[PDB]
Amino acid sequence: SARTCPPNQFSCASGRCIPISWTCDLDDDCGDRSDESASCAYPTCFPLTQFTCNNGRCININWRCDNDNDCGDNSDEAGCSH
Secondary structure, three states: OOOOOOOOEEEOOOOOEEEOOOOOOOOOOOOOOOOOOOOOOOOOOOOOOEEEOOOOOEEEHHHEOOOOEOOOOOOOOOOOOO
């Protein structure tokens, strides 16, 4: 493995190994420590593969349940629950 996490993959606190796009996610993935402090300067969440929650949050693009992307306010549906 080059560095730590694969090429198309991001190593948060170095030891944590997630796909790149999750870096600038706003809290939920890692938090801030290095994920938001070593790349994030965004007014657009992240132009890799992400969704922009309508509450003002940014969320991962793979939370599409009903049709839109799970966040929990008035966006997607506000929580694909069961």
